[PDB]
Amino acid sequence: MIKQRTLKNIIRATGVGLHSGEKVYLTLKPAPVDTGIVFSRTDLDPVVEIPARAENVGETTMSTTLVKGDVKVDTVEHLLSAMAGLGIDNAYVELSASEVPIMDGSAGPFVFLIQSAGLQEQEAAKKFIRIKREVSVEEGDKRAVFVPFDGFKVSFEIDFDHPVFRGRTQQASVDFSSTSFVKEVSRARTFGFMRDIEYLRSQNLALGGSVENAIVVDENRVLNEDGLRYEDEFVKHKILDAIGDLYLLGNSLIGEFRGFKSGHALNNQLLRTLIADKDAWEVVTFEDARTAPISYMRP
Ligand SMILES: O=C(O)c1ccc(-c2ccccc2)cc1O
Ligand SMILES: [Zn+2]
């Protein structure tokens, strides 16, 4: 069968919150079958757990924030993108502060840390949500949709009227049967604009942001001295963000997601509409990993 996965070993990392600028210690720990991904604020006494489920998303301004009352875990989406990409079902994520560390602004450091510690296959079938019917949410000129697809594919379009985006790829499709999440999505970095930073900092956003963890765009150029990792890095990062936001479903998807200028808010609205629309999906398992329409890397 396709088996549930957790970590083989405890993983530790240090960094700072993109939005808070706060130093934070991150610990990834194995968890039992059917735990899901559960975040834990170990700086609080008592410790507070918040499961990484759509119902616990409380703010979607410029990241996906898990909230339980006054307790927040901000910017979960890059780490959840890495776990979706590697097929991690079950993990405890301990944080000493209210925000996941940004690392280099991508999922690269997370996929590296997880594959270094290794994956553990668990003796329980991995459960997928298979899309049986179209489910779409729109708001103004933004759209997010699921459609039936025998596999997992993401299509995304952005549309920035900024000179740095002019002539540059603003649409991409990634079929995970034919493309590596690690090689083609994980290393795409968060990007920000100089023209925004004064307003964003007034909102306690991007307080930890710099060229060390973000692509910074000025009037007519990328400021990062080493430039882009991909010509299409911006749209590849929105695909990374979508895979992380959509992993708050709690299970991997069998279907296609298309995003049209959609961000954390509409992605979460699409999850909530899908969960309510039970005739549009079913849970499926695969008794033979070799015959399944999706494959994960050897653990
Ligand atoms: O969203 C982000 O990821 C982000 C990152 C960095 C900056 C930033 C940092 C320093 C100067 C200018 C912009 C702004 C941002 O919105
Ligand atoms: Zn992001």
Which residue in 270, 273, 272, 264 sits closest to 60, CA to CA?
Answer: 264
Whether 173 contacts 232, CB under 8 Å:
no
Burial of 14 (0-12, 13-18, 19+ CB in 10 A): exposed
Same domain, 239 and 136: yes
Indicate whether 106 and 142 sit together in one domain.
no
**By three-state DSSP, how is residue 203 classified?**
coil
Shared-domain flag, residues 227 and 288: yes
Closest CA to 158 of 145, 142, 136, 181: 142
DSSP state string for 164-200: TTTTS--EEEEETTTS-HIIIIITPPPEEEHHHHHHH
SS (H, E, C) 51-103: ECCHHHEEECCCCCEEEECCEEEECCHHHHHHHHHHCCCCEEEEECCCECECC
Which method resolved this structure? X-ray
What long-range pairs does 222-227 form, CB within 8 A, spacing at least 24? 222/164, 223/194
Q: Which residues contact 122 (CB under 8 A, 6 or more apart)?
A: 3, 4, 5, 6, 32, 33, 89, 90
CA distance 174 to 193: 26
CB-CB neighbours of 54 under 10 Å: 20
Claim to verify: residue 3 and residue 144 sit in the same structural domain: no
Do 169 and 233 share a domain, yes or no? Answer: yes
- Is there a single domain that holds both residue 89 and residue 159? no
Residue nearest to atom 11 of ligand 1 (CA): 194
Q: Dig out the tokens for 97 from the structure.
A: 């502060």
Give the angle subtended at the CA of 38 by the CAs of 247 and 25, to the nearest 5°. 105
User: Number of folded domains in the chain?
Assistant: 2
Q: Which of 111, 130, 264, 270 is catalytic?
A: 264
Omega into 46 within 30° of 0, i.e. cis? yes
Identify the domain boundary among 106, 127, 148: 127
95 and 123: one domain?
Answer: yes
Residue with the smallest CA separation from ligand 1 atom 7 is 192
Our answer on whether the CB atom of 214 is closer than 6 Å to any ligand 1 atom is yes
Q: How far apart are CA 282 and CA 249, in angstroms?
A: 13
Tokens of 230: 């991909």
Question: Can you read off the two tokens belonging to residue 43?
Answer: 């700086």
Strand partners, 191: 215
236 and 266: one domain? yes
Q: Resolution of this entry in Å?
A: 1.6
3-class DSSP state of 273: helix
Round to whole Å and give the CA distance between 205 and 216: 14
Q: Based on the fold, state whether residues 117 and 188 are members of the same structural domain.
A: no
Q: Is 264 a catalytic residue?
A: yes
**Residues 213 and 297 grouped into a single domain:** yes
DSSP H or E run through 3: strand 3-7
User: In what helix (H) or strand (E) does residue 205 lie, and over which residues does it extend?
Assistant: none
Closest by Cα among 38, 41, 64 to 51: 38
Among 58, 93, 127, identify where a domain stops: 127
* Tokens of residue 279, six digits: 């005739």
Asked which of 127, 155, 185 is the last residue of a domain, the reply is 127
Q: Identify whether residues 110 and 189 lie together within a single domain.
A: no
76/13 same-domain check: yes
User: For residue 295, what are its two tokens?
Assistant: 């494959």
Note down the domain range covering 159: 128-299
Cα angle: 241, vertex 114, 13; to 5 degrees? 85
Separate counts of helices (H) and strands (E) for the chain:
6, 19
Give the angle subtended at the CA of 265 by the CAs of 260 and 267, to the nearest 5°.
55
